[PDB]
Design a protein around this nucleic acid. Sequence first.
DNA 1: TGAGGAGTCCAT
Lengths: 54, 216, 55
Amino acid sequence: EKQTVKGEPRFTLEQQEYLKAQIVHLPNQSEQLLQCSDAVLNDVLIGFNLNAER
Amino acid sequence: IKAFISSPDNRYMLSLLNRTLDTTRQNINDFIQFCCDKWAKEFNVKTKTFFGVNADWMRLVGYDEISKHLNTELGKVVVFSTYASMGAGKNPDYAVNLALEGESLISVADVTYSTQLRSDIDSIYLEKPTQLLLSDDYSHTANQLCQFHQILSLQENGELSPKSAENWCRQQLMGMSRERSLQQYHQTSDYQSAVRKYIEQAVGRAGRTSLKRKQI
Amino acid sequence: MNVSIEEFTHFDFQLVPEPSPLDLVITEPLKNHIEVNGVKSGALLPLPFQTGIGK
DNA sequence: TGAGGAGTCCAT
């Protein structure tokens, strides 16, 4: 975000988004789940027909 | 401790030990306390004592509590900790308070101007590292595997003759104690280098800023 | 929004920030590694650095 | 007679 070359910002706003969306962090299985939200899990469950299962 | 209090330009001392001085040794703690006070009454100064610096106090109380006391009040601070605990968390620093300043901090850098101003440790005491032999707590067979790994590894490089290796392995198979395992590793040459490594790392982490005192 | 590589259509790739004593030591051995036994070959490089200076 | 302790990941 804050790297400058010769007194001018090195990266424009749109370029920063592309570079910042290419890095992934991989936590535990038990911390990846509690980080999610109700909407995400509900969307996945209805998208694969898993709610009907007992 | 007595040497540290009788100093003009020092207000921070950290004693690295091998055991935690928590409530399980409460009595011993109290014994030191009134001693410090006695010395603190000889040379007119008020000293701060910090006890129980473990992993359950740096993540449940906050280490910043120490730092604040060095930029909001006058006094010397003595903190007790261990080798392993101080290996985690990093950067035990307080920034500045020129009103509370000990009339001199010499800048050490040549071409820099720091956005803020910070300093680091100026007095440390080092004990003898102990329990320098790896062990495992998971299950009972894994510990055996670890021990045999280390014995054979020492045999390969050239520190142990075959005759000694067989004796150590035989007694481990029959059964020994930790305190008899530690007495045969001390006779080799790897122990010396390991101790030196510990000292070098513990001292190297004790400096991270460019504001320093004169006498350390 | 989904950005694309077309944003970098015209970009400056041959200008880099001014070097430091600690990046030449990283770069030059690797360049000597590609010349001989190169193209496809690994390299183990232990760098002895110090806390403080910007490792 | 021989030595003397805390700190950690992850899938079940």
